C-alpha cells in the first residue's frame, strides 16, 4: 500500500460493465448521422472554435468535425475514412450497419 | 495528547521525503504482493482465447494489444519490485521473440508460493537453494521431451505448419491465411550460406479493404511520387547516388568573380552546357532510372526529362541502403557516370495507386531477390498494428528454427510432464530443501490453469484428467480448446508445437527473476521529483 | 550564550552536547552497515529520484547512496572513500571500528574521566598493535594457487557462490598476463567491457582487445583471418586552412578544377596507405586493418573499401597504447616515414552486432601485455554489480603481489591483538590503562559481527575462540557453518597486509580527533548567496 | 556537416530543454520520435541536429551534464524526456557548491573522463562533424569551473573544429552569490584564447522586456527561457534550412570576427512587444527593422550611443517580396549612419528564410559587434579589484589547491582585454594637483 504499483491517477475498468458501456457509446455516434440518409435526408451545421461554419451532408465529413475522445467510438470514425478512401460512397451506410 | 518522538539513530538522520523499509514484514512480504498484482494484469491475455486489452499512454495514443511485452512497455510502473520482472520479460523478447507472457505467469507464481514457505518456518537462504536445484533439474529433463523436428526450412508447405501455432495464439480465426503469407516472404529472402537476417522483411501498411486482400511483393515499395514526366519502365538499369543531383561546389566558401563584359555574358551559357554533357554521359551507359538521396535541381530535371530518364528522390540513409541491396547496385558519392558493375537491375519500375495513396514499386520477377516486402490492407490503424506485431512474432519463430530445429509439445503438455518428473525427483531428496523443490514443480501448473480459465471451463477437471492420462505414459496429451466440456487431446498428432529454445530461455530467466527479488532484505528510496 | 548575543540565528552545541551528537550519530551508521560484513551479509536495494535500481553490498557504494544529512556522517564518508581508491577493499570494517571505538571511549567518559586520558591510551595501544601485526604476517612465493585463495576470499563476499568461481580465474589470469618483472603493475590496461546479452555466467577473458565500434562502410569485410594492424591518429578528414581563405573563380569550367584540387591534401595520405598495402600484402591472402583516432570522410572510406582495407575511426585515447603492447606496432602521428617495420600483427579480427550496437574483436596476439574482461548479463543493475566486484578483486591480488606477505583473516588476527594488548596494559602507568582496555574491545567487533550475522550467539562463541589461542598458540578464527574454532591458514582464508595496516592507522586518527571536539557551531553565512 | 550541442549546470540545462522543444514542433517531430510532416522542405537538412535510428525514429545530438541528479531528473521526468538518448544523461552525486575551485579541480576532474567518452560515441556516428555548441552560465561553479575544464580538454582533443558558445553574462545589479566576481573573471580569461566567439545575454534585459514592455508584473524564469530560446533558434536558424548562399558556421567567424580576440557579440530579437502592441503596431518592414537600433531590444548593459559598432548582421524570416526588404535596408543603413562604424562600412549581412519561426506573423534576428561591451567588462573588474584588496572569502579558493597567483593573473588579462576595446574608439582618450611648472 505505501508504494503503489502504477502511478496515481490511472483509470482501470473491466468486465461486463465495461463492455456494455462501449456498446451504448457507439449508439451516440450513429445518432449524429442517422437522419442524413435518403432522398429526403437533411444536413447538419457545425461551428468550430474560431466561428467558421460548415454545412455538409457527407457522412465521413461530419464525424471528422466532431471531437470524439471515447476510445471505442473512434473505431466507428476510422471505418468512415476507410469507406471514404476506397470507394468514396457509403460512409453513412457502413456506420449504421456497424 | 502526546506523540511518539522519532526514536534515535538512522531514523533521525534520514532526509525528508525518503523511505526506509526493513525486515521480512516490510520488505519481502510487500514485494511479493507487488509482484503478484502485476501477474493478474496480463494473466487474462494468455493463450488463443486470451482477450485483447486497450491501453492509452500519456500521449493520447491508442493501443489494442494481445502481446504481453507490448502492454508492459506502455504501462508505466513505479514499484521497484515489479520493475525487475519487467526487465526480465524485455530481455526474453530480445533474445528469443516469443514467450514474453510465460515469464510473467511463471515468475509471478513462484513468488506467491514462496510466501507460505517463509510463513511456516523456512528461511530465504534455503528457499533459493531449493529453487536453483529444480532449475538445474528442469533443464536436464527438457531434451527428453522433444517429439518433432524441422526437416527442411525452404519447403513452403512444411514451414506453414511450423508457424501456425506461433500465430494461433495471436489471431485466432485467421491463423491459416497469415501463416501462408509469412511463409512465402521468409522462404524467398532465404540465403544459401546461412544467416537469415530479420530486418530483410519489410511491412507496408495501406488503408483500405479487409485483411484477406493483403499480399506479398518480391521487392520494395515506397510511398513517394515521381518528379519527372516519365512514369513507368519495363526493363530498368538503375544508378544510385548518395549526392544531390546537381552541379557541385567547393566545400570551402567560393564566389564567382567577373571583370569584363564577356565573362558576365558567357557565365550563364557555360554552366548550362556543362550540365547537359554530364547528364548525357550518364545516359550513354544505358541507365533508365536515377535515384538520389538529396535535393534535385531544375536544370537537371529539365535535361533528365529530355533524355527519357526517370528520376526519384528519397532521403532516409536507411531506405537507400536497403534499395542498394534489393537491386544489387552500389552507392556513389559523386555525380559520375556509373560503371557497368555499379548498376543494379530490376524487371519493372512503375507508379501505382492503392486505396487513395500513391506508391512507387520496384518489382522483381525473380523468386528470391535480396529482400521482400509484405503489403497490409485493413480497415483501421489499430487493426494493422496488431497484425504487424503478429507478423513479427511469426518471423522471429522462423529465425529460431534456423538456429535450432527441435520442437516440444505445447498446450500444457510440456509443463505437466515437468511437474510430474520433478516431484518424483523431489521425493528422493531428504532435508529441508525437499519442500522448495515440490513448490517449484507446483508452479508449472499455472500455465495449464491459465489456458483453462480463459477457455471458460473449470481448471481442476482438466488438471485432474491430464495427470491421470500422463500416469499411463502419454507424453503428448494436452488441453483441448474446441471442446466446450473439459477434455484432453493428443498434441503431436494435432500439430501443436513450440520451439525448444523458447522454453529453455523462458525457464532460465523466470527463476533468475524470482531469486533476485528474494535476495533483497531492505529498501532505501529517494524522494520523487 | 556568548555566541548567540552576536549572531542570534546561529546554531551551536556546547561541551557535553557536542560529544553526545557525534557518538550517537556515528553509532547510527554502524547499525545499518553491520549487516554487510561477511559472505552471509544481506543485499540492499537503492532507488534514486529517477526511479533507477542499484543492488549493492559494498561499503563505500552504500555510504554515498543513502540519503543522509549530517556533519559527522560527512567526516566518516570522506575517510571511507580515501580508504577505497588506494587499497580497494576494507571500507565496511572501517566504519564498524570507528563507531565501536567511540562507544567504548564514551563508556568511561560518562563516569567523569577526561577524554584526553583515553586518547593517550589509544596511541599506546596503536603502537603495540602495529608491532604485533609485523610478526604474524606470512611470507610466501605468490604462486598462482596462493593468489587464487586471496582472490577467492575477496570475490566471495560480493556475489553468489557459483559466480565467484568464474570471476576468480579471470581476475588472477589477467593480472599475470600483463605482469612483467619487477616493474609495477600498471592498471588501465585491463579493459572492462560490458555486453548486455546472455546469462551472467559467460563472463570470460579475451587475450586481446574488444572495441565498441566497427566498420562503417557497407562493403567492408566482416572477418579477417590474418591481419596487419596499423595504429595512427592522423586525420583523413577534410580540413581547411587556419588562415581565412576563399575560392574565387571565373566560370563553370574553372569551378570544377578548384573542386577537384581541394581534395589533394587528403588524397595524398590515402595513397600512402594503399601503396604500403600492396607492398607487404602482395597477394590476396593476408589482411590489413586500419585503426584511427580521428575521423574519416566518406570519400576516404570509398577509396579504402576498394582495396579491402578494414578501417575504424575515432577510437579512444587509451587504446592508442593498449593496441601497441597487444599487437606490437607503433602509434604514429604522420605518414612521412611510413615503413613496414611499424605495422602490428593479429591473428583474427571479426565483427559482432548486438541490435543497435556493434563490436569488433582483436584476438590471437603473439604475446599480449594487455587483455580485456568481457562482462555479460541480463540486466543493467547486474552488470554494475559484477563491475564493482571485479574492481575489488584486482586490487586485492595486486596488493598481495606488491607486498611479499599475506595475513590470515576470518577474524583470527583481531583476537590475537586482543590477547596481546591485554598482557601489555599492566605495564603502562596511570589511568591510560583504561584507554588500552577500550581499544582491546574495539578490535573484537569483527569476530562478533561475523558470528552474529551467521545466526550464533556472540558471547558464547567468542569465549570458545578465546578458549583456544590461549592453550594452543595457533591462529584460530571463526567458522561460518559450525561456529567452531578454525585454523585460518589451513582452510584458505586470507587477507591483504596493507589493508590491515592502513585500517588501524585511519580508524585511530579519526576517533582521536572526534573525541577532542569542544563544540559544534554553525554561525557563518547561511548560504552562498 | 554535423554539429553537437552540450549543456552544463543549472541555466544551461533549462535553456537546452526548451531549445529542443522549440525545434521538434517545427520539423514535424513529436515527443515519441516519429516525423509527421507533409512538407519535404523540413526533412532536407533534418540530419544536421539529429540522428536517425532504424524504424524512422530521430534523436537529438545533445549531452546533458550536471553534478546533481535533481536537475537531470527534472528534465528526464518532465516533458520531452522520453525523446533523449538514454545514456547521454551524465550526473554526479554531490553537486559543486558554486566554489569555482571545487568545479575546476576536485569534482570536474573525475567526471570529464566519463563525459569525454560519450562525446566520442556521438562523434563516431557522423561522417564529418563541423563543430560544437556549449550552453552554460558564468555564475554557478559547474558552469564556470567545469565549463572551463571541459573547453580546455576539448581543444586538445579536437584541433581545428569551431567552438561556438552561448553564455549568459552576470548582471551584478542582480549580484546573487556574494562571491560572483571571482567566478566570472577566471572563466572569461580562459574563454578569450579558446573559443571563436561567445553570445552574451543578461537577465536584466531579460527581466525588462517581459515585465515593462509586455505584461506579467512577476515574470518567472520559465518565461525567461522562452525569450532566450527565441534567440537560440535564430542565430542557429539558417543552418537547418536551405538558402541561396550556403552560410556555414565557419564563414560566420571570418565574416563577423575581424580580430581573433575581440569576438563577443550581443544578439537581437525584434518581433515581440506588448500583447496589444503585438496587434495594433503595424508590423511592417521599417518599424520592425527600427527595433534593431533601439535602446529597448538590446540585451546587454552597454549604451551604444557612447559606443561605436564594428559589424552587423541581419537575418529575416518569412515569405516576402525581395524589393521592400532591400529598400528599407537601404533607408535604415543611411538613416542613422551618423552613429555607425569608424572604418568598416557596409557591414550589413542579409539572410532570408521562407518559413518563419512557428507562432507569429513576422520575425527577424540581429547580431551586432559593439565597442560598448567594455563598459560591462570594466564594471566586473572594478568590483573584483575592490574585493581582492581585502582578500575576502579567499580561503575557500586558495585552500582547495589553487595558488593565489591565479587571481592576480586573471586580473591582468581583464585589464588587457579592456584596453583592446578602448583602443578602437579614439573618443575615450578625452587633474587635481597644482604641478604645471616650467617643463
Ligand atoms: N431513387 C432512390 N430510391 C430509393 N433509395 C435511394 C434512391 N437513391 C438513393 N437511395 C438510397 O440512398 C442510400 C445511400 O445514400 P448515400 O448518401 O450515398 O449514403 P452514404 O452517405 O452511405 O454514401 C442508399 O441506401 C439508397 O438506398
Ligand atoms: N491450438 C492451441 N491450443 C491450445 N493452446 C495453444 C494453441 N496454440 C497455442 N497455444 C498456447 O499458447 C501459449 C503461448 O501463446 P502466447 O499468448 O503468445 O504466450 P507468450 O506470450 O508466452 O508467447 C503456449 O503456451 C501454447 O500452449
Ligand atoms: N570464507 C570466509 N570465512 C570467514 N570469514 C571470511 C570469509 N570470507 C571473508 N571473510 C571475512 O569477511 C571480512 C570482511 O570482508 P568483506 O565482506 O569483503 O568487507 P570488507 O572487506 O569491506 O570488510 C574479512 O575480514 C574476512 O576476514
Ligand atoms: Mg507466442
Ligand atoms: Mg572485500
Tab-separated table of C-alpha atoms and ligand atoms in Angstrom, chain B residues 45-48 66 98-102 165 168-170 410-412 451 479 481 496, ligand 2:
chain	number	residue	atom	x	y	z
B	45	UNK	CA	-4.049	-12.046	-22.081
B	46	UNK	CA	-2.704	-15.618	-22.267
B	47	UNK	CA	-3.494	-18.273	-24.845
B	48	UNK	CA	-5.565	-18.366	-28.029
B	66	UNK	CA	-2.659	-9.074	-27.048
B	98	UNK	CA	8.067	-15.127	-28.142
B	99	UNK	CA	7.158	-16.245	-24.652
B	100	UNK	CA	7.016	-12.833	-23.002
B	101	UNK	CA	3.905	-13.910	-21.088
B	102	UNK	CA	5.249	-17.273	-19.927
B	165	UNK	CA	0.911	-22.421	-33.713
B	168	UNK	CA	-2.761	-19.323	-33.349
B	169	UNK	CA	-2.300	-17.505	-30.024
B	170	UNK	CA	-2.492	-14.055	-31.655
B	410	UNK	CA	2.533	-27.460	-26.406
B	411	UNK	CA	-0.857	-26.785	-24.908
B	412	UNK	CA	0.291	-27.537	-21.367
B	451	UNK	CA	-5.358	-21.558	-20.514
B	479	UNK	CA	-5.563	-29.270	-23.238
B	481	UNK	CA	-9.727	-25.825	-26.886
B	496	UNK	CA	0.657	-28.081	-31.878
E	2	LIG	N1	-4.140	-24.546	-30.658
E	2	LIG	C1	-3.788	-24.326	-29.370
E	2	LIG	N2	-4.435	-24.941	-28.360
E	2	LIG	C2	-4.094	-24.730	-27.080
E	2	LIG	N3	-3.104	-23.908	-26.697
E	2	LIG	C3	-2.373	-23.228	-27.606
E	2	LIG	C4	-2.684	-23.405	-29.026
E	2	LIG	N4	-1.824	-22.629	-29.703
E	2	LIG	C5	-1.029	-22.008	-28.795
E	2	LIG	N5	-1.359	-22.365	-27.545
E	2	LIG	C6	-0.712	-21.889	-26.300
E	2	LIG	O1	-0.386	-20.503	-26.369
E	2	LIG	C7	0.718	-20.273	-25.493
E	2	LIG	C8	1.579	-19.098	-25.933
E	2	LIG	O2	0.777	-18.077	-26.510
E	2	LIG	P1	1.109	-16.543	-26.177
E	2	LIG	O3	-0.159	-15.888	-25.693
E	2	LIG	O4	1.885	-15.954	-27.327
E	2	LIG	O5	2.078	-16.673	-24.900
E	2	LIG	P2	3.531	-15.988	-24.861
E	2	LIG	O6	3.217	-14.515	-24.847
E	2	LIG	O7	4.145	-16.501	-23.585
E	2	LIG	O8	4.217	-16.456	-26.117
E	2	LIG	C9	1.518	-21.562	-25.468
E	2	LIG	O9	1.830	-21.905	-24.119
E	2	LIG	C10	0.602	-22.608	-26.057
E	2	LIG	O10	0.418	-23.652	-25.103
